Subunit: 157 residues, 6 copies
């Protein structure tokens, strides 16, 4: 009955994201990971690749599923009969930006947002920084699931 | 059965707290509001007065109940068969202090913490500031539940 | 003979901006809103019009376009104060650098005012983005502006 | 007929405070410094004296003690603006809450001004602490104040 | 020739502090840990106990020594022919407070301060929070050196 | 032999940068200023011009040398037999972004980062803001070394 949407680009999914997924799935009856796409800017990975990487690393979470979308997140949420967004926060700076979006989403659609604090070990990891470091040859193998690291290296080469 | 504990001194409960209670009660199967008893800091209202003010303001939340609590929060949470805390966040520094405590609570007991963003309207209200303003004759009636405001007038004369 | 300049791109002006204008206009004899010419949704002329329409009840405020150094705009009009709204500590830190630079190069001071709680989450950019994908932002914009924005999207 | 109140404990006034006073006095017709009576080093009378000595070149500023709600102090003097200096984003977030409460209960506005870079690290409390253990704070305080502080310590 | 002072109350020293010590000792010829005492407020541990706990957990750092002091830190630094302070920072909030003190110290004595970012695993640990959690029975064994944990439990009992 | 790398685009070097250089050169046996070459973002001065401006401003720092660099910073650091980075910090958000990168750099290569707090006088200056102000006729002469200001005038006509 209870449920939440976990949104992001997940380009690619990181161990920080996976931590958030696991914590949401432990506390909500169903969790939907929403891979949100900008049809006007390609990321590193295609939608199909992003979904595949997420599924391969969440096979142990039976109440989680993965879907893509675009446009307003609150539309994606409400069309599935849900009313909650769950997101990870790493810093007070993340909080101020996400706070704005959360209040806008509540204002326009009545959708609530719940934040969860990053695990300390992943506080510095982001998809963007992992891609940048890997582009220049840095070792990011401990920051990404097995479903991701070698696919990332493949894209870079 | 999903559930969470909402901890605080609630001295007195404000419309900001009530907003958090309502949002948590909408998303979890059960919410326990834990009114913290602190032997040292004896505030304005007794624990029983605080509990009754919360019950009055949450009469329409059937899956929310109110209890007093003492000592380590994660023990309170765990002894009730729960594994989640829910709290409101108003600002960046709110997040900084709470992040530390959420990480500590997850480390020592495996209890997770979910934060909800304040409604814009109540971003500036706190129990302490409302009491301080009220003490010197300021009008805080738009910031507190109806019942609370009447009881507050009483303790001031 | 007090006075202050309220600068921004205002693309478009929001109720958050209007709140700052009203508050500045209540505390200074003269307020100039400076619409900065610098990719936008509205033209400078349209922005000025929208602000002018929304500030009709403010007798001591006028609206003008501007280019170049803000402190030159301010001092060429005989003033030496800037008034700006602030939402967050992050807002403050960015604006702090600008304010100190502006004081250093030209002796122009900057006064910040805290956002009204109700508009803490509103920004021109977020309002445009939401409206673009169909969300209702009418409670966040002047009535004038809102209709004008619908026109630009359709 | 513009005006603003500059509140604080000023125990003692620093050059950081004085900078805020000078800047407020340059942009408002009337400035009242409100010395708040609330454990201090100086008495309210001594604080007022120190501020009065340091603000001699500011004709449109006066100094007064105050108790109770700041917004009552402000409105009883016919004004509805507070001016305060800010050093940090953390300063801003604390003051933001107060400013919004004050606007809510009494319609009093608050204008913040960014610290001069040179005094970003100075506070009454840190100056007193350093002076107590023998450090030289003379570059951070009005000449008057500095001598008065030496007296309190010896 | 190069050297730095690492100051604090260390009441008690934590694994976060020890991380800072090790990183300073790797980069400076000598490191002095300054246990700074307030003669007007006793902490949990006496000066002798604090020093002993630090020495027992830094025996593998041959260029580090531990001394106590009081009064102005810049005096402690300069009396040893040094001109540098090294401190750990966990958050932007730590930074703003420490920035003030660093600029004051540079102003009054010409002493420089170097900050180092906390290890991610210890970002939430502080002496004060560890003492508070332990006081109410929470498990802080993974946050403190072996030289500290059981002595802490002993003080509490 | 202690040492550190001070990285940046330095386009142009400011008095703020020079303050960091001087403080690092006072505390480390060797400082290497690394002028980052970025193929995409071609700024105002060529790399050789940037290197010469830094050498002119650091003529009295015998243990500081200036080099150009490309690619992963921790590779630059390690190939010079060093294991430390030194950078200035002006504000809280400076710290937030830099903290992430320092933790990443320590994770991927074991390279540490030391931050120095800005001198109050230069808290507001940056290469980008100085260039922007200069372009429109503002006087930035008090914010840049003497030599830099003359060269800046040249590139503007
Ligand atoms: O993948 C993203 O774009 C993204 C960004 C920011 C995020 N915060 N929390 C989560 Br889960 C998350 C995901
Ligand atoms: O991977 C990212 O892009 C990203 C960014 C920002 C984020 N905040 N919290 C989390 Br989990 C997170 C992840
Ligand atoms: O009442 C309190 O002490 C208190 C404090 C902090 C809080 N955060 N979120 C909530 Br609900 C809350 C309540
Ligand atoms: O009442 C307070 O002191 C208090 C503090 C901190 C808080 N965060 N979120 C909420 Br609702 C809240 C309330
Ligand atoms: O419209 C803008 O570009 C803009 C930006 C930033 C701003 N801060 N305060 C105000 Br009023 C303001 C306006
Ligand atoms: O509209 C914007 O882009 C914008 C940004 C930042 C802002 N701070 N305060 C205000 Br009012 C404001 C407005
Ligand atoms: O002296 C004080 O108590 C005090 C505190 C905080 C302050 N912010 N801005 C100013 Br001026 C100021 C003064
Ligand atoms: O002196 C103080 O205690 C104090 C504190 C905080 C402050 N912010 N801005 C100023 Br000026 C200021 C002064
Ligand atoms: O023990 C303390 O008081 C203390 C405080 C704050 C600190 N930051 N970095 C270090 Br090492 C440190 C030590
Ligand atoms: O243990 C503490 O008291 C404490 C406080 C604040 C701190 N910042 N960085 C470090 Br390491 C640190 C340690
Ligand atoms: O020149 C830059 O790009 C740059 C940026 C950021 C920086 N932090 N500290 C230093 Br020195 C520094 C230099
Ligand atoms: O020049 C810049 O862009 C820049 C940025 C960030 C910086 N932090 N510390 C220093 Br010095 C510094 C300089």
């Amino acid at each position: 009955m209870t449920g939440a949407v976990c949104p992001g680009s997940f380009d690619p999914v990181t161990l920080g994201h996976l931590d958030v997924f696991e914590r949401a799935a432990a506390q909500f009856d169903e969790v939907i990971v929403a891979v949100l796409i900008n049809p006007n800017k390609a990321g590193m990975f295609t939608v199909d690749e992003r979904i595949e990487m997420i599924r391969e690393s969440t096979a142990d979470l039976p109440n989680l599923r993965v879907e893509s979308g675009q446009g307003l997140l609150v539309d994606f949420v409400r069309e599935r009969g849900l009313n909650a967004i769950v997101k990870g926060l790493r810093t007070g700076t993340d909080f101020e930006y996400e706070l704005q979006m959360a209040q806008m989403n509540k204002h326009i659609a009545g959708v609530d947002t719940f934040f969860v604090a990053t695990a300390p070990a992943y506080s510095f990891v982001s998809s963007s920084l992992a891609k940048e470091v890997a582009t220049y040859g840095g070792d990011v193998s401990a920051l990404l699931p097995a479903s991701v690291h070698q696919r990332l290296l493949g894209k870079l080469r």
